[PDB]
Structure formats: C-alpha cells, structure tokens
C-alpha cells in the first residue's frame, strides 16, 4: 500500500495553470493605482477552486499581501486582478509573486518611478507600414511593456529625410512616405504606435542625426559652409553612400550654431508634430582629419557636447513635459573617441553606446559602462551591442545535402561548411529544395550562405512550401572565395515539417553558389550571459523591439535572427530581474580593490574576479544599506561577451565564504537570480565567524546556472 512510480488519478498537470503576469503599464508613478493582471487556465482535467494570492517584495522584504477565490470548470480561463497603490518613495523597484495552489504560480514585476531615466528599459519600433492597424500597433507595444517592462521606445527610420523628417505637400502632411530605403512609412500607423507608448506609460524616442542631411539639402535652405570636409578647400564633404548612386547623407559641423538651428528645428518639429517625449540622436562615429568649410583643422570628437547641450536648451524651452535626450557614443570602449567629452559635458538625461570591437571581454564591457557610471555623474547606461552578430547561428542544412535539380556540387573555394556546395545554380529550371523541421510555431529566419563574383546581383525565387514568397538577391562581392549570409527572409511557419526553395525562373539573373541554409538563432546561453553582465555591470541593454523581435544588427528592421520560445521566457525572467532589483543593480557602487586578499572565495570550482574564462566571476557592489555579491557562471565558455556560447557548466552545492567589514553584522543572506523560483528573493542558511582575512559569513549556495545575486 504506496504511491506508485506516477501518481495515480484523474488530473493533469503541465498544461495551463498560471499563463501570464504582468501590469498595464510599464512603469508608475507614487500613489498610482497598479492593475495586476493574472491569466489562469484550467487544464486540470476538471473543475478547481481555490485562492489565488498576490505578494509584492521590496528586494528581502514583503510589503503587500492579498488573496481572491477563483473558480474554473475544466477547460477554463479566466483573467483576475488585483489592485495595489504604488508605494510613495519614488524610484523603487518591486517583485510580485502569484501562488494559485495546484493551478500553479507566476511572477512579475513592479517600477515605481516618476521619471524613466533613472531606470530606462529601451526597446525599439522600427517599421511603421499602413497594413498595421490600431489594434496591432496596440498588440505589439503592450507585448513589450508586460513582457519586459519596456518603458522607452526608440523609433528607427520613422522619418521622410535626415534633414526634412516629416513629408510636407504644400503645407499638408503627406499621408505615407518613402525612406531612404524605400520603405512605405505610414503617418497614421506612426501616431498609433506613439499612443499607444503612452498609454502603457512609455516614452517615445525619435532617432536622428547629430550631423546628417540627405542628397540635395541647398534648397532646404541648408549651406555647405556649416559642412564638415575631408580636405582644407573643402572639395570633398564627409558623406555616406548607400549603395545607389544617388542616396546620400552628408555630413555637418555640430558646433556650427547656424546648422544647430537648422536640426533642432527639426527635432522641435518632430516633438509637436508626432507626439515624441524626446530624441534619441545617433552618428556614424570616429573620422579623423576635419576641416570645416574654410579650412581650419577641427577634432570632431569634442563639438557633440556644445550642439546636444543647446539641443536640450531648445528642447526644455519648447516642452518640459517631453525633451528627453540621449547621444550615441558610437564605438564604446574606455577612453574612446568622443567618450570622454560626451559623457562628462553633454546635457543627456541618460547615457547611450554602441559596442563595436574595441571592448570584446566582459571584464572590458564592465570597465567600459563604469567609466561612463563615473563621468556621468552616476546617469543610467544604455547599451547597443548587437548579439552574435557575425555568427551564422541557428539550425544548419547544407545546399549539397538537400534535393538539387540541374545544378552541381563542388569543392573548389574554401571556406564552405559541410562536405562542399552547390554551384552551377545559373539557369532557369535549376533548383535547390531544402527539408527542414520547425520545432515550434513561430517566426523562423532563412538565412543563405552564399559566393557570388559574377559582377552584379544574382537573383533566385525564394519558395515555401510551394508556394512563392519574394524574389531574392545575393550581393556581388569581389571574388568567388567571398562567403556571405546576408541574405535572409524571415517567415512564420506552423510546427513541423515544411519545404524551402530557391528555384532559378524567368526574370532571375546571375549566378550563385549555394553553401547552406541556416535558421537563423539567437543562442540563449550567450544571450543571458551578456544581459547578466551588463546588468550587474550597472548598465541595460536594448535588444527587443517591434513584434517580440530581437535586434540582431544596426538596422533596427534587420530580422536575419529570430528569438526561440526559451530565449524568450528566459527574457521575460531576465527584464522582471532587472525590474524588481533596479535599487540593487543600478544605485550601487562597486567595492573598491580588496587589498591584500580578495573578500569573496569559493570551493570546488575555479573564480575569478575579472571576468575569466572558464571560471565563476564574482563582482562585490555596495549601496549604503546593502552588501551585494555576483555571481556570473562562466565556466564551460570564453571571456567574449558577443559570440555564441555553451551552456554554462551548471553547479550545485557550491560552498562561498564572503568577508564583511569587521564593524558589521549579519542578521540574514539572501539570494536571487532570474534563472532560479522566477526571480524570487531566497532566504539561505547561512554561518558566520572570524578567520585571519577578518569576519565572514559562510554558506552553501544551492545552484548557480548563469547568474546569481547575493546580497545582504
Ligand atoms: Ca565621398
Ligand atoms: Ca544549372
Ligand atoms: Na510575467
Ligand atoms: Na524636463
């Protein structure tokens, strides 16, 4: 008489329970009433009844308990809430657990705060197409805010001209226009994605340049003297070309107070006129060797400051409610070009960097956003920093192993993965049929790699499950050893088997050889690792954006990569994180040098303190009220923040002694990790004592997967 190898019974588990917890808006102000919204389903295999019981932390401490009964027949859903006040202190961040018993449990988390730039959580919206209606824009924002508690929207190439950012005609704003790509862009569909950024409490971010006008900018009643010039009798102003031989920016002295005026009219345009709370004013970073219109030799790198200080003059002058600012630090690194300057003189509300190559380690990254912490008087740190960006990530089928009609294999330029690839792919009838496997519904990007020196663009017909999708085109590149994959379309696909074909038809042109077919990935491991990094580092990181896209590359609408549903559940664990502990990863300090011996030592792995290698890195950061330990697992992988990665070698059991200071004691040590029980503050057992290093508390850390904060 025993329970069994199963339990035994007529109800299921699994399926259902507690499927979603979020809010209505992405962040609150003190004294606002808090919806929290909890979608339940009954997949028990019949009728539940019970409590469902809210909870809210302030980091160890509960501070809000309420409970409502709840009733389902199987099958059923329902969505309940809850109702809470946003506690008075401003800038705090809160955990909110949801326990409904044998239905299960969930998590959110909670921002309180008056002014997001103190805790900013960017994403982006990079398309604005006619075919999306109010209901959709309104999907696709609120996503992003109860996912991630996204609460800055960065609009990329929403504008007509660098230069003329919204379409007029006689006056009238034109009703779509084209980008310089082309792209249809929508007016109206532009206002209901900035409303509907308001509605969940957000900010919208509209890009522009510090410096760029288009092709043609003299009747706009731009002059070339305020331009910047590649030579000392300005013969060759500094530009940009696209590719057409038409499409141009060309670029300006910022310091140059008549073209200042010229922008920020502009800016001050785009603000009124769409309904924008700010600019977010981007460049093409480091050029050396500027003249201005009259010859005299000028370092770009200091002129940015003076023009975005006079940008938030105009901006604070023409509506207080919405002059929100930043500058791209392209290129960051310590002591980059322009980093300097911009983070100490600048008048930005938070500070904002692309991460090219000059900061590949952790342990860089970390120097890089500390110098930026420092010089900018502790102002919030954004990061732009494009993950696995040069890996062909993703599930791989070669060309050569799939089903070919009239075409070849070959072997005869190095660097194709696989046993060869396909060449002979020049005439009509010719084809290549890839068989592949969709693990889940959703969006899938199919990304060739591809040689291609016949002198122009090649062109094939991209074909899914018989049925034609787009005409494609693989660049011309300068000899036949040139491997590329910059040639993609993203899909949705159902669950399971479908056919992908490039067949060679009339109007193709050209020729290609065909290496493979990859669906483009982002590798999760690597993914949250770096947001880990980043973020006990002090700094966050924009990534999501638009439809749950991730941002695989500088062009916002680039979609070469697509997030799986683990990446996206451990993004959701990730963004409540850096939510619910705000206080703890962006108010505090890290602890200065250790002298001596190092405070923080661990048994049975090897540790590192910058960021090594196959270790566990521990980072020490203090606030004034709280000592706090990271932990980020970096055994099983490099020190590069960027690539692909392994899963990190997962511990458990894995024994810590922490030093305290000698004047300070102990009552309790605490640990939370997103990896771990949602994000949930766990109370650990611990001792204390004294050694020759000084006073310590030691204590069993019970797992450690990526990372993990201790703090007490
Ligand atoms: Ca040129
Ligand atoms: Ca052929
Ligand atoms: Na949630
Ligand atoms: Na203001």
Same mark, same amino acid.
Do not use: C
């Given at each position: 008489?025993?329970?069994?190898?199963?339990?035994?019974?007529?109800?299921?588990?699994?399926?259902?329970?507690?499927?979603?917890?979020?809010?209505?808006?992405?962040?609150?102000?003190?004294?606002?009433?808090?919806?929290?919204?909890?979608?339940?389903?009954?997949?028990?295999?019949?009728?539940?009844?019970?409590?469902?019981?809210?909870?809210?932390?302030?980091?160890?401490?509960?501070?809000?308990?309420?409970?409502?009964?709840?009733?389902?027949?199987?099958?059923?859903?329902?969505?309940?809430?809850?109702?809470?006040?946003?506690?008075?202190?401003?800038?705090?961040?809160?955990?909110?657990?949801?326990?409904?018993?044998?239905?299960?449990?969930?998590?959110?988390?909670?921002?309180?705060?008056?002014?997001?730039?103190?805790?900013?959580?960017?994403?982006?919206?990079?398309?604005?197409?006619?075919?999306?209606?109010? +209901?959709?824009?309104?999907?696709?924002?609120?996503?992003?805010?109860?996912?991630?508690?996204?609460?800055?929207?960065?609009?990329?190439?929403?504008?007509?001209?660098?230069?003329?950012?919204?379409?007029?005609?006689?006056?009238?704003?034109?009703?779509?226009? +084209?980008?310089?790509?082309? &792209?249809?862009?929508?007016?109206?569909?532009?206002?209901?994605?900035?409303?509907?950024?308001?509605?969940?409490?957000?900010?919208?971010?509209?890009?522009?340049?510090?410096?760029?006008?288009?092709?043609?900018?003299?009747?706009?009643?731009?002059?070339?003297?305020?331009?910047?010039?590649?030579?000392?009798?300005?013969?060759?102003?500094?530009?940009?070309?696209?590719?057409?031989?038409?499409?141009?920016?060309?670029?300006?002295?910022?310091?140059?107070?008549?073209?200042?005026?010229?922008?920020?009219?502009?800016?001050?345009?785009?603000?009124?006129?769409?309904?924008?709370?700010?600019?977010?004013?981007?460049?093409?970073?480091?050029?050396?060797?500027?003249?201005?219109?009259?010859?005299?030799?000028?370092?770009?790198?200091?002129? #940015?400051?003076?023009?975005?200080?006079?940008?938030?003059?105009?901006?604070?002058?023409?509506?207080?409610?919405?002059?929100?600012?930043?500058?791209?630090?392209?290129?960051?690194?310590?002591?980059?070009?322009?980093?300097?300057?911009?983070?100490?003189?600048?008048?930005?509300?938070? +500070?904002?960097?692309?991460?090219?190559?000059?900061?590949?380690?952790?342990?860089?990254?970390?120097?890089?956003?500390?110098?930026?912490?420092?010089?900018?008087?502790?102002?919030?740190?954004?990061?732009?920093?494009?993950?696995?960006?040069?890996?062909?990530?993703?599930? &791989?089928?070669?060309?050569?192993?799939?089903?070919?009609?009239?075409?070849?294999?070959?072997?005869?330029?190095?660097?194709?993965?696989?046993?060869?690839?396909?060449?002979?792919?020049?005439?009509?009838?010719?084809?290549?049929?890839?068989?592949?496997?969709?693990?889940?519904?959703?969006?899938?990007?199919?990304?060739?790699?591809?040689?291609?020196?016949?002198?122009?663009?090649?062109?094939?017909?991209?074909?899914?499950?018989?049925?034609?999708?787009?005409?494609?085109?693989?660049?011309?590149?300068?000899?036949?050893?040139?491997?590329?994959?910059?040639?993609?379309?993203?899909?949705?696909?159902?669950?399971?088997?479908?056919?992908?074909?490039?067949?060679?038809?009339?109007?193709?042109?050209?020729?290609?050889?065909?290496?493979?077919?990859?669906?483009?990935?982002?590798?999760?491991?690597?993914?949250?690792?770096?947001?880990?990094?980043?973020?006990?580092?002090?700094?966050?990181?924009?990534?999501?954006?638009?439809?749950?896209?991730?941002?695989?590359?500088?062009?916002?609408?680039?979609?070469?990569?697509?997030?799986?549903?683990?990446?996206?559940?451990?993004?959701?664990?990730?963004?409540?994180?850096?939510?619910?502990?705000?206080?703890?990863? #962006?108010?505090?300090?890290?602890?200065?040098?250790?002298?001596?011996?190092?405070?923080?030592?661990?048994?049975?792995?090897?540790?590192?303190?910058?960021?090594?290698?196959?270790?566990?890195?521990?980072?020490?950061?203090?606030?004034?009220?709280?000592?706090?330990?990271?932990?980020?697992?970096?055994?099983?992988?490099?020190?590069?923040?960027?690539?692909?990665?392994?899963?990190?070698?997962?511990?458990?059991?894995?024994?810590?002694?922490?030093?305290?200071?000698?004047?300070?004691?102990?009552?309790?040590?605490?640990?939370?990790?997103?990896?771990?029980?949602?994000?949930?503050?766990?109370?650990?057992?611990?001792?204390?004592?004294?050694?020759?290093?000084?006073?310590?508390?030691?204590?069993?850390?019970?797992?450690?997967?990526?990372?993990?904060?201790?703090?007490?």
């Amino acid at each position: 008489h025993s329970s069994g190898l199963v339990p035994r019974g007529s109800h299921m588990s699994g399926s259902g329970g507690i499927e979603r917890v979020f809010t209505d808006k992405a962040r609150y102000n003190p004294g606002d009433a808090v919806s929290i919204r909890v979608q339940a389903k009954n997949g028990t295999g019949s009728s539940w009844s019970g409590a469902a019981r809210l909870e809210i932390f302030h980091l160890e401490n509960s501070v809000y308990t309420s409970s409502q009964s709840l009733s389902l027949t199987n099958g059923q859903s329902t969505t309940l809430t809850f109702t809470w006040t946003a506690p008075s202190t401003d800038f705090r961040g809160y955990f909110v657990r949801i326990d409904a018993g044998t239905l299960g449990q969930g998590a959110t988390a909670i921002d309180v705060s008056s002014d997001f730039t103190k805790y900013p959580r960017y994403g982006y919206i990079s398309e604005f197409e006619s075919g999306e209606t109010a +209901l959709e824009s309104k999907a696709k924002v609120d996503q992003l805010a109860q996912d991630y508690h996204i609460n800055a929207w960065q609009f990329y190439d929403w504008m007509w001209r660098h230069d003329k950012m919204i379409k007029r005609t006689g006056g009238s704003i034109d009703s779509t226009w +084209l980008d310089l790509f082309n &792209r249809e862009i929508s007016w109206s569909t532009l206002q209901n994605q900035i409303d509907a950024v308001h509605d969940v409490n957000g900010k919208a971010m509209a890009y522009a340049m510090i410096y760029a006008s288009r092709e043609n900018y003299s009747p706009l009643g731009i002059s070339p003297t305020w331009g910047i010039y590649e030579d000392s009798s300005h013969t060759n102003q500094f530009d940009v070309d696209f590719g057409d031989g038409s499409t141009y920016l060309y670029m300006f002295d910022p310091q140059n107070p008549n073209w200042q005026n010229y922008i920020h009219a502009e800016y001050i345009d785009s603000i009124n006129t769409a309904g924008f709370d700010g600019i977010h004013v981007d460049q093409m970073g480091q050029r050396s060797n500027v003249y201005d219109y009259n010859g005299n030799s000028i370092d770009l790198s200091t002129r #940015f400051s003076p023009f975005l200080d006079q940008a938030k003059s105009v901006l604070s002058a023409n509506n207080p409610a919405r002059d929100n600012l930043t500058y791209n630090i392209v290129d960051g690194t310590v002591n980059g070009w322009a980093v300097n300057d911009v983070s100490k003189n600048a008048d930005l509300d938070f +500070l904002y960097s692309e991460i090219w190559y000059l900061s590949d380690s952790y342990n860089q990254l970390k120097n890089y956003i500390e110098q930026l912490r420092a010089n900018g008087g502790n102002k919030a740190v954004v990061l732009a920093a494009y993950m696995n960006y040069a890996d062909n990530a993703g599930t &791989r089928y070669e060309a050569e192993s799939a089903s070919m009609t009239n075409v070849s294999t070959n072997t005869n330029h190095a660097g194709y993965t696989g046993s060869g690839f396909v060449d002979q792919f020049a005439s009509t009838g010719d084809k290549v049929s890839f068989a592949i496997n969709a693990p889940e519904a959703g969006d899938y990007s199919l990304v060739f790699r591809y040689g291609n020196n016949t002198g122009a663009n090649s062109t094939l017909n991209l074909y899914v499950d018989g049925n034609f999708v787009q005409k494609l085109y693989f660049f011309n590149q300068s000899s036949w050893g040139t491997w590329k994959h910059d040639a993609w379309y993203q899909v949705p696909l159902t669950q399971g088997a479908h056919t992908v074909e490039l067949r060679y038809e009339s109007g193709n042109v050209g020729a290609v050889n065909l290496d493979s077919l990859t669906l483009g990935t982002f590798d999760e491991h690597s993914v949250r690792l770096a947001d880990a990094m980043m973020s006990a580092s002090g700094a966050t990181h924009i990534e999501l954006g638009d439809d749950n896209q991730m941002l695989p590359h500088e062009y916002y609408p680039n979609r070469s990569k697509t997030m799986r549903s683990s990446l996206k559940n451990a993004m959701k664990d990730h963004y409540n994180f850096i939510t619910a502990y705000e206080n703890l990863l #962006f108010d505090s300090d890290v602890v200065p040098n250790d002298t001596g011996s190092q405070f923080v030592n661990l048994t049975g792995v090897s540790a590192s303190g910058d960021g090594s290698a196959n270790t566990v890195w521990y980072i020490n950061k203090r606030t004034s009220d709280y000592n706090i330990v990271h932990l980020i697992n970096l055994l099983g992988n490099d020190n590069q923040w960027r690539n692909t990665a392994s899963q990190p070698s997962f511990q458990t059991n894995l024994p810590a002694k922490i030093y305290i200071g000698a004047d300070e004691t102990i009552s309790d040590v605490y640990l939370a990790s997103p990896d771990l029980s949602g994000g949930e503050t766990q109370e650990l057992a611990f001792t204390s004592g004294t050694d020759a290093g000084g006073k310590y508390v030691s204590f069993t850390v019970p797992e450690l997967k990526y990372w993990n904060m201790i703090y007490m």
